[PDB]
Amino acid sequence: EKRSKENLPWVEKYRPETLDEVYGQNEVITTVRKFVDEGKLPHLLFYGPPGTGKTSTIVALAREIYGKNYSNMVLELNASDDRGIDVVRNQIKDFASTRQIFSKGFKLIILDEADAMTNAAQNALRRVIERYTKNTRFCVLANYAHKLTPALLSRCTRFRFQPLPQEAIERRIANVLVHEKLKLSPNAEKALIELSNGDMRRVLNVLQSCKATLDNPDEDEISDDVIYECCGAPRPSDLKAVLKSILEDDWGTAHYTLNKVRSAKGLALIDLIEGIVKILEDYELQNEETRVHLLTKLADIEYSISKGGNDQIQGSAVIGAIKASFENET
Amino acid sequence: TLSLQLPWVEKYRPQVLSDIVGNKETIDRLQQIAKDGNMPHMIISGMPGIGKTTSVHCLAHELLGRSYADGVLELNASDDRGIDVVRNQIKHFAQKKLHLPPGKHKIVILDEADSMTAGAQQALRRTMELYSNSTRFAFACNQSNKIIEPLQSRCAILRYSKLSDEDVLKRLLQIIKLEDVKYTNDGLEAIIFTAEGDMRQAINNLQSTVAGHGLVNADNVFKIVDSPHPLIVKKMLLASNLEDSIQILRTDLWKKGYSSIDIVTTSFRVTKNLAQVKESVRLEMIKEIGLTHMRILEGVGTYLQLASMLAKIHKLNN
Amino acid sequence: SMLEAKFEEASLFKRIIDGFKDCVQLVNFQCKEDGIIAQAVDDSRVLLVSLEIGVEAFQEYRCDHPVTLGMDLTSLSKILRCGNNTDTLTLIADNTPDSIILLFEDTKKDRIAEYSLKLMDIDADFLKIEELQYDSTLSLPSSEFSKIVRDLSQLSDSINIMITKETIKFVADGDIGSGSVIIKPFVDMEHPETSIKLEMDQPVDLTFGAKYLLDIIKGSSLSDRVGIRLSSEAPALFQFDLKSGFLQFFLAPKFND
Amino acid sequence: FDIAHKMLDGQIYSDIGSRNFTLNDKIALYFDDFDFTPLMIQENYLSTRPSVLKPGQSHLEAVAEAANCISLGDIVEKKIRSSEQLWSLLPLHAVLSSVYPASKVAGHMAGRINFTAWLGQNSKSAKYYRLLQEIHYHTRLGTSTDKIGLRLDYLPTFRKRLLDPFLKQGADAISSVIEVMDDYYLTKEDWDSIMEFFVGPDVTTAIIKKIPATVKSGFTRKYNSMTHPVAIYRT
Amino acid sequence: LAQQPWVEKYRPKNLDEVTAQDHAVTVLKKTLKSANLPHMLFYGPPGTGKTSTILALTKELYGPDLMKSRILELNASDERGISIVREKVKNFARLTVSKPSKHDLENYPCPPYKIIILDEADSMTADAQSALRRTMETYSGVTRFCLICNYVTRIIDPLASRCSKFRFKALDASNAIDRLRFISEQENVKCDDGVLERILDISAGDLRRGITLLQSASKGAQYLGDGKNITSTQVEELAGVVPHDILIEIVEKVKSGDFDEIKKYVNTFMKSGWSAASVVNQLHEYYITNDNFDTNFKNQISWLLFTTDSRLNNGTNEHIQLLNLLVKISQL
Amino acid sequence: SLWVDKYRPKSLNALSHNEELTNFLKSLSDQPRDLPHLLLYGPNGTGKKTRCMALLESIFGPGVYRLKIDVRQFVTASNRKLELNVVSSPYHLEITPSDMGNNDRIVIQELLKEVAQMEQVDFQDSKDGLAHRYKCVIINEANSLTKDAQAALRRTMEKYSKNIRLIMVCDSMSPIIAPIKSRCLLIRCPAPSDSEISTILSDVVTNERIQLETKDILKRIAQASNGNLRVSLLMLESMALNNELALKSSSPIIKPDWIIVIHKLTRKIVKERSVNSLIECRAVLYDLLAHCIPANIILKELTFSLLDVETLNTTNKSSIIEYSSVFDERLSLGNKAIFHLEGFIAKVMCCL
DNA sequence: GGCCCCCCCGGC
DNA sequence: TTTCGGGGGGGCC
Ligand SMILES: Nc1ncnc2c1ncn2[C@@H]1O[C@H](COP(=O)(O)OP(=O)(O)OP(O)(O)=S)[C@@H](O)[C@H]1O
Ligand SMILES: Nc1ncnc2c1ncn2[C@@H]1O[C@H](COP(=O)(O)OP(=O)(O)OP(O)(O)=S)[C@@H](O)[C@H]1O
Ligand SMILES: Nc1ncnc2c1ncn2[C@@H]1O[C@H](COP(=O)(O)OP(=O)(O)OP(O)(O)=S)[C@@H](O)[C@H]1O
Ligand SMILES: Nc1nc2c(ncn2[C@@H]2O[C@H](COP(=O)(O)OP(=O)(O)O)[C@@H](O)[C@H]2O)c(=O)[nH]1
Numbered sequence A: 001e002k003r004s005k006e007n008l009p010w011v012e013k014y015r016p017e018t019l020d021e022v023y024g025q026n027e028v029i030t031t032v033r034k035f036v037d038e039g040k041l042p043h044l045l046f047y048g049p050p051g052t053g054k055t056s057t058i059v060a061l062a063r064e065i066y067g068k069n070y071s072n073m074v075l076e077l078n079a080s081d082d083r084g085i086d087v088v089r090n091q092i093k094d095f096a097s098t099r100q101i102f103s104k105g106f107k108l109i110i111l112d113e114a115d116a117m118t119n120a121a122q123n124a125l126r127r128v129i130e131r132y133t134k135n136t137r138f139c140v141l142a143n144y145a146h147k148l149t150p151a152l153l154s155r156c157t158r159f160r161f162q163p164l165p166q167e168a169i170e171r172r173i174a175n176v177l178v179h180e181k182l183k184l185s186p187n188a189e190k191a192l193i194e195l196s197n198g199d200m201r202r203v204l205n206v207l208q209s210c211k212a213t214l215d216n217p218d219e220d221e222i223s224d225d226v227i228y229e230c231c232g233a234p235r236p237s238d239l240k241a242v243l244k245s246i247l248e249d250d251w252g253t254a255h256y257t258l259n260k261v262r263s264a265k266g267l268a269l270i271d272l273i274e275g276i277v278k279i280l281e282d283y284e285l286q287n288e289e290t291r292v293h294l295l296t297k298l299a300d301i302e303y304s305i306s307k308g309g310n311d312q313i314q315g316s317a318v319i320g321a322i323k324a325s326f327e328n329e330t
Numbered sequence B: 001t002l003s004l005q006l007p008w009v010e011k012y013r014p015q016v017l018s019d020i021v022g023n024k025e026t027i028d029r030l031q032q033i034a035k036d037g038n039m040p041h042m043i044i045s046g047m048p049g050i051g052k053t054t055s056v057h058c059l060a061h062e063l064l065g066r067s068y069a070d071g072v073l074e075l076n077a078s079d080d081r082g083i084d085v086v087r088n089q090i091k092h093f094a095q096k097k098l099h100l101p102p103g104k105h106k107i108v109i110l111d112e113a114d115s116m117t118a119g120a121q122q123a124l125r126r127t128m129e130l131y132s133n134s135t136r137f138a139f140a141c142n143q144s145n146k147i148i149e150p151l152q153s154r155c156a157i158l159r160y161s162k163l164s165d166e167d168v169l170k171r172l173l174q175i176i177k178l179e180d181v182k183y184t185n186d187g188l189e190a191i192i193f194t195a196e197g198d199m200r201q202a203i204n205n206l207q208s209t210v211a212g213h214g215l216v217n218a219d220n221v222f223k224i225v226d227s228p229h230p231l232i233v234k235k236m237l238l239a240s241n242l243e244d245s246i247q248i249l250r251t252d253l254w255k256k257g258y259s260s261i262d263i264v265t266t267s268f269r270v271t272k273n274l275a276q277v278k279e280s281v282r283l284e285m286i287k288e289i290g291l292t293h294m295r296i297l298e299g300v301g302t303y304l305q306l307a308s309m310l311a312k313i314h315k316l317n318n
Numbered sequence C: 001s002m003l004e005a006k007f008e009e010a011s012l013f014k015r016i017i018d019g020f021k022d023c024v025q026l027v028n029f030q031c032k033e034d035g036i037i038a039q040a041v042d043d044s045r046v047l048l049v050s051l052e053i054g055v056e057a058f059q060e061y062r063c064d065h066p067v068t069l070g071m072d073l074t075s076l077s078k079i080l081r082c083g084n085n086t087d088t089l090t091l092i093a094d095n096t097p098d099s100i101i102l103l104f105e106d107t108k109k110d111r112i113a114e115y116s117l118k119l120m121d122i123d124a125d126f127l128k129i130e131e132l133q134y135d136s137t138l139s140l141p142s143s144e145f146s147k148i149v150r151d152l153s154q155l156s157d158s159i160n161i162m163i164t165k166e167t168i169k170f171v172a173d174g175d176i177g178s179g180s181v182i183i184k185p186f187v188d189m190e191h192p193e194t195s196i197k198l199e200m201d202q203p204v205d206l207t208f209g210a211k212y213l214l215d216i217i218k219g220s221s222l223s224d225r226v227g228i229r230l231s232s233e234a235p236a237l238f239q240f241d242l243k244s245g246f247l248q249f250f251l252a253p254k255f256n257d
Numbered sequence D: 001f002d003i004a005h006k007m008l009d010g011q012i013y014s015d016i017g018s019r020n021f022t023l024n025d026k027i028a029l030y031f032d033d034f035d036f037t038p039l040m041i042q043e044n045y046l047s048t049r050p051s052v053l054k055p056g057q058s059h060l061e062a063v064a065e066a067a068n069c070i071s072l073g074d075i076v077e078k079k080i081r082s083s084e085q086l087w088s089l090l091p092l093h094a095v096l097s098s099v100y101p102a103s104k105v106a107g108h109m110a111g112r113i114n115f116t117a118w119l120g121q122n123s124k125s126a127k128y129y130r131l132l133q134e135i136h137y138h139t140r141l142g143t144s145t146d147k148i149g150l151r152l153d154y155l156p157t158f159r160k161r162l163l164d165p166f167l168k169q170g171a172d173a174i175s176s177v178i179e180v181m182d183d184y185y186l187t188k189e190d191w192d193s194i195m196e197f198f199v200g201p202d203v204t205t206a207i208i209k210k211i212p213a214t215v216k217s218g219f220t221r222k223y224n225s226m227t228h229p230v231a232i233y234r235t
Numbered sequence E: 001l002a003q004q005p006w007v008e009k010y011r012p013k014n015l016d017e018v019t020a021q022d023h024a025v026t027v028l029k030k031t032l033k034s035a036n037l038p039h040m041l042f043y044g045p046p047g048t049g050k051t052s053t054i055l056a057l058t059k060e061l062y063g064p065d066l067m068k069s070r071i072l073e074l075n076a077s078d079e080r081g082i083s084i085v086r087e088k089v090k091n092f093a094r095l096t097v098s099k100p101s102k103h104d105l106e107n108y109p110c111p112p113y114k115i116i117i118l119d120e121a122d123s124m125t126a127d128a129q130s131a132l133r134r135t136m137e138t139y140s141g142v143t144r145f146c147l148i149c150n151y152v153t154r155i156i157d158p159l160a161s162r163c164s165k166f167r168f169k170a171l172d173a174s175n176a177i178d179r180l181r182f183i184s185e186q187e188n189v190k191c192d193d194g195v196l197e198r199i200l201d202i203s204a205g206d207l208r209r210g211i212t213l214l215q216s217a218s219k220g221a222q223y224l225g226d227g228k229n230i231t232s233t234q235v236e237e238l239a240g241v242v243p244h245d246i247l248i249e250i251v252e253k254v255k256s257g258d259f260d261e262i263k264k265y266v267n268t269f270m271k272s273g274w275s276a277a278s279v280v281n282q283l284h285e286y287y288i289t290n291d292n293f294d295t296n297f298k299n300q301i302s303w304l305l306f307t308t309d310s311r312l313n314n315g316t317n318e319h320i321q322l323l324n325l326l327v328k329i330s331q332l
Numbered sequence F: 001s002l003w004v005d006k007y008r009p010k011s012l013n014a015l016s017h018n019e020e021l022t023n024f025l026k027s028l029s030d031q032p033r034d035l036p037h038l039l040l041y042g043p044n045g046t047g048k049k050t051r052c053m054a055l056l057e058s059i060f061g062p063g064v065y066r067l068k069i070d071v072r073q074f075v076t077a078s079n080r081k082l083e084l085n086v087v088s089s090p091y092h093l094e095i096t097p098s099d100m101g102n103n104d105r106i107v108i109q110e111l112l113k114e115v116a117q118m119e120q121v122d123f124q125d126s127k128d129g130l131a132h133r134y135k136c137v138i139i140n141e142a143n144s145l146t147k148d149a150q151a152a153l154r155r156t157m158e159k160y161s162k163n164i165r166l167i168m169v170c171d172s173m174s175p176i177i178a179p180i181k182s183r184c185l186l187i188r189c190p191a192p193s194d195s196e197i198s199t200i201l202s203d204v205v206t207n208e209r210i211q212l213e214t215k216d217i218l219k220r221i222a223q224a225s226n227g228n229l230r231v232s233l234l235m236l237e238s239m240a241l242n243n244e245l246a247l248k249s250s251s252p253i254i255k256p257d258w259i260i261v262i263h264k265l266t267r268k269i270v271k272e273r274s275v276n277s278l279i280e281c282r283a284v285l286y287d288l289l290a291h292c293i294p295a296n297i298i299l300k301e302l303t304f305s306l307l308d309v310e311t312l313n314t315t316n317k318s319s320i321i322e323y324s325s326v327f328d329e330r331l332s333l334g335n336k337a338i339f340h341l342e343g344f345i346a347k348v349m350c351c352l
Numbered sequence G: 001g002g003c004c005c006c007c008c009c010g011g012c
Numbered sequence H: 001t002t003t004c005g006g007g008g009g010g011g012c013c
């Protein structure tokens, strides 16, 4: 790196260093801590969605086992490094079959993002894992479990990293606010958690952008409005008004309301579609075909939007689909 | 803190053929062959965590006794097994001269022989024949179809079956007795339920429990272990109403952290093998699931797409 | 400039780099007022290389403050090949440099070739793994060691070294057969350059990979003798002494099982 | 052939047959040869007497449904063999290209199972496209059009200017024809290639064969007795 | 200069020349003082000023001289396979930042990191994108990444998670009129009232298209040599907008409902070269915003128009699609 | 030399239809130093390439018409060798990357970038010897380019505009991606009217001295071309040759062979509706496709011929057009065209 | 010993 | 047949 840690992005500045700084995965953290505290470390696998703390957890565990010099006592490989059959057959085998250079102890191999590895390399890894288990332990990290071969999964003990809970996100936000000398409104925190979707990376990025947005962060307070302008996301009031107009007004009024709401702050149609879907999924529809039509048509519109197209036609299609689907309610 | 304990999967790996559970007929045949000798060329096939490598290693050890280090040549996917290797190293080993008891022969073990290329398998053909009076070959594979027909013709087929709940329970109870592990019946039932006939997974989960929480009960097992998501997908796709299917998809899969691609692939696989639904309905469901899978691959992987897939599936199943 | 170090003949640095370029990928130099000390670890984390070129090897060596330089040996060798084998070589660096300057000068003519190699942000420590008290320390001509390694590596991919009272044994056990070479200490007053010395504390028996020894023996072109220090529970040290510095290979033995 | 015969059998698609020969077995049968099963199915799905027709459905409607699914499977195949290598979709292709259409027209073969004719036709199309490209770049300087426009519009008039004269004025046409060729940097090989493109009522094979041998010999002698320009040097 | 197209000649030189992207330009300017620039992912519709914004940020961060030693720009014209990602990008990100000069440190902030700009990142394969995941995080102290794309869905989820997202809003007559008026004033283009608003409405979020249309109108006016204000009719003619007379003829033929007459009219219409996208857009505008049609008619026509637009977006024949759409509307 | 090519205009003043487009092109050429990238779209055979050449001749000198063909070599990642035939002039260059199919991308990354990133030696009309002008590159059939090939053009146009200017010509704009359309000045090229086609044909006849009983002949030929001037000229030449350079009132209109085959296929589809008929239709489709007849052309002509039948009702025509739209989309997204054509024919047979 | 080239799979 | 990427096995050197 260069200069102090204050030059780093918040996603990297607040990376957990120890195992007590990881939040939202209490069960997994406790289990791994107990395993490391008694020498009962098996071949580990961490399966989870993006931005949940798998890499942070494994690096913290390696630091706990070895110490500050963990980088000189582990073999860490990821998607940026070639991991072909030759690599598995030579480099990994040599690392697993040899003693530590610096200080005594067992050998740890961290194959981060192993789901990117080919089937041949994973197959070659089988006996490598099973033969040097006396002195070596393997850790695998994955987001998609369908890419891993059945045998490799069979040889590993699985741990699932759940989407981050609300309480853990609030505690981390409190720590970040205290360190950064920031003030966050309760509704601002609510909006941040809602838009995070269980990812701490999104929380930290949005909070950094909000801090940048404030003119005088020293005594200014971050409000839900700041989040909405920073992210460009529709306000809940805007979504509610659009849905109300679509559901109990004529086509002209609905079109005018949608256009005005979108042009007030330059909102995107995709965010509106997601918001309306979230609102409608809480509705109690009398008829199932209403929900079926809503889901099918909105999914089609979302797929069409994903490839460009005409924005006005797409908005009119959204309005018409909602109206037609709700006509079935009677 | 820097010293590792041997996992139970390796600490209690069967060392004699009598300790291998399941496939009683094949194990009895192997035991009688060891008692008499004259081991033939064989191919052991099956699924993960059943005891193929254990069976081959135990047979070779008991057959060759003290001469294991000189009469056994073991090669796996972690070793180079190209055409040159087959034509030089294996040929030299087969042509080697070694003194063994009357009815004993050198053993060439090729673990995970499925990965071997066609050229190497073809080269092995005449080598297995010219030197059959001193060397015998034992292939171990997961998919027998990957071994060429000429090689299959020369060997004895040994297709292993998945371990039943009774055998897994027996071996697990032996391990518990040896390690003096407090347990409850429901915990063992949950361990077997998650094992799905895989002894390695069963032992790994049993160690994770006890190592993690102590007394083995359903609560701790399910705290550390997750019920196989294929069953959840099957329940989701068999719901009577769209509301229930969406509720399952949200609570049990989406909020648990499972990716959309994993969910759609599992749905495809589960729909393929739903013997209680008509073939035409399954084919229509597979068409819809393929449309959704293509959409997800294009990059649009969202809860809305999976909900639309479920809605279309319920449309078809009506 | 902050650091200015002149090699009278570029062949010296080219040879020193040539001694360990086949076993490591990224090297880290750390220049001080007492010379240039460099470290390099291999991709498999099995072999470490430590070089300690002294100030007596340069025509003039000036270094104000300690300076770190992370480089890739491939690019360094590529550029060093550019310069001729009859020209003076100046290594030049500035305060917190972004590049290292290699200046080839031919006094015969007025031709000056300056090459700037961009540095890498390699942040690591040396840890000075030089375990105090070893179990055995032997010294013998590099030619004999190279011959033994080349002969035995052709039998097996692993070589075992046993140190017993007045006995050094190299054993290889391959597929076609096995090979053992036994050498005992001896001294020749007429030609001490060929003598073999052994100082023993406890018996030693350590296995090593043949590839790493084959890489290490390439340093025999720099020194006529090699010192091998062995100790259980510690990496094996292979030292080649130079005019003012030395080159050390720390090789981790294989797990016994 | 065996895969086509087994997969186009109505027994396996019945309730009892599907119970014995399952969908997984059908997908495995496809995977036995995944490069030729779709082509064989597409070739042999119109030559069977079905035994799985739904009540009120006709053979033509089932054929149309099978063709629709075959087109969808073709799209999926194009996606698989792309810049992204989406091989994970191979099982879906199995259901879209081979299994579903056969299940829709499963029955008893009404004739000999025929080998797929798409490969030879594709090779012929590639050869003719290369010939068309050669003609186009031999005449680009004098023409204002693309290869498709050259084939669809120009070539008939070139026939009227190049082949008709030989049929009317006998050997005397040679000179004129040569001139036209010289006006567009055309050679004898290009002449034959152009004559080999027309289809339908404008096939010149029989007419060309009927041309007198002496006329063709004189045309060749005249062509080889002169010096002709070159459109592209070192082709 | 006078030898360059207006679109390139009026490319924002600094971050103060970006017209309607303040919600992100504000934080980008703040980074100039905070020196903690995060990994950025710019996404939005065409011609919203993403490449210009990143280039201006580089201008204001490093300066004219230190730029080339601190920027690595790769676009779709450059090979960006998995091998390239794992070798060239990794090597550049691993290097130490170039030494600034005394002038650079005296004038420009010179943050302590370099920038890699993967423009048009939506054209990169999934494996190549995955190869960047740990490269972005490991060397964040010396390198920062800017991924610029048009379709955010084509970026894999981990990469989007690692990058702070910035959406560029569409440019319309309410937020981009000032820049177009400034360009016209500098270029001395005399236009009637509402001509610039009409240009921006026709552009539909693309300011580059609006500038090009203004340049075309200016060239036409200069060649005419009449010294008269440019009118909206000429702007519409240069933009390929169908005249309202043809549109009312089309809707009347659709109202008639005869298949043969509609087919003949479409055959005659297609010989004029009108783009099907413009026809569909104008038909949508005419129908959805007309009080003479009931709710059900609009409900059906909205879906029909959406289907036709989606089909046209896949490079399909315009004649067949237009005929099908018109027939279906006539049968509503 | 055919009359279609022997009387092609070579200057903006020689154009004889769509005078508004001619004036627009003259205005563009008045101050060509700041000319943006151009994209000419319109029906086939209208005269788009002629107008592009006339605009180039207006910008540069008459020397744009001295064209020479050369061969450029390319190497793929697999070492496969590829060849591209490039037409070049002392002032402009021409390329048709679609000729290499999916490999067209390489052109945009190798040839074009080579032209724009380096200056060119100009030893004529120059004193220093280095060109003081931008190079004009013409991409034909731009609508046939792959999406990645088009994406490779964006920064090339946006970075080297000071040296390279692109004039793309396409028949349809739907295949072109939005960024490329945004980066170009769009020029619509309307098809010539019947009166203008008749005037051109009359001029050609007078120059060639072809006897005409009445001028109405040229009218009918104009109507049979559906606005295609190239087809009109070629048809006039063919009829004149087949009628001994003398056209009478009874002279039939000659249609090309593939159109006749498609019409016979339509008649067969209408008459018979069965699976055997579908097999014979597959045979005919294979015959058509094996002779360099594009699948999209086959689909369009078949659909319109079916819709031009005096025996089908409105419902049949609606079903036919819907199926044609669906299967045109399928063809755009597929590789094996025969499958989609057979599916369309089967659906049409079912509906009828 | 190292490039360089050609050929062949890719689901479960 | 067939659009990358990975692996093997042989041919120059
Ligand atoms: N449980 C967590 N507690 C605190 N911070 C977290 C947590 N999880 C993620 N983060 C934050 O997000 C950043 C990235 O965390 P990561 O460990 O990279 O997540 P990840 O699951 O390994 O990412 P993937 O699966 O490779 S996309 C960290 O620097 C943390 O600041
Ligand atoms: N029949 C068995 N009886 C007791 N333990 C078994 C049995 N099968 C498997 N195990 C246990 O699981 C561990 C691994 O068994 P393996 O023999 O490696 O399975 P495998 O079928 O050879 O694996 P594959 O097919 O290469 S994925 C053994 O060490 C045993 O501890
Ligand atoms: N915010 C803006 N302010 C001023 N001019 C703009 C702005 N956005 C676009 N333009 C103008 O349009 C031209 C092109 O802008 P670009 O930066 O290339 O847009 P872009 O979004 O990066 O293009 P894409 O997404 O790769 S198609 C600029 O040179 C400007 O002349
Ligand atoms: N007399 C005359 N002929 C024209 C004109 N424009 C085009 N043509 C003729 O029409 C033929 C086809 O023109 P072309 O540009 O190749 O069609 P396109 O490229 O498909 O647009 C040419 O051979 C010309 O001879 C014109 O303005 N006047």
Ligand SMILES: [Mg+2]
Pocket: A054, A055, A056, A112
């Ligand atoms: Mg990670």
Ligand SMILES: [Mg+2]
Pocket: B052, B053, B054
């Ligand atoms: Mg095994």
Ligand SMILES: [Mg+2]
Pocket: E050, E051, E119
């Ligand atoms: Mg851009």
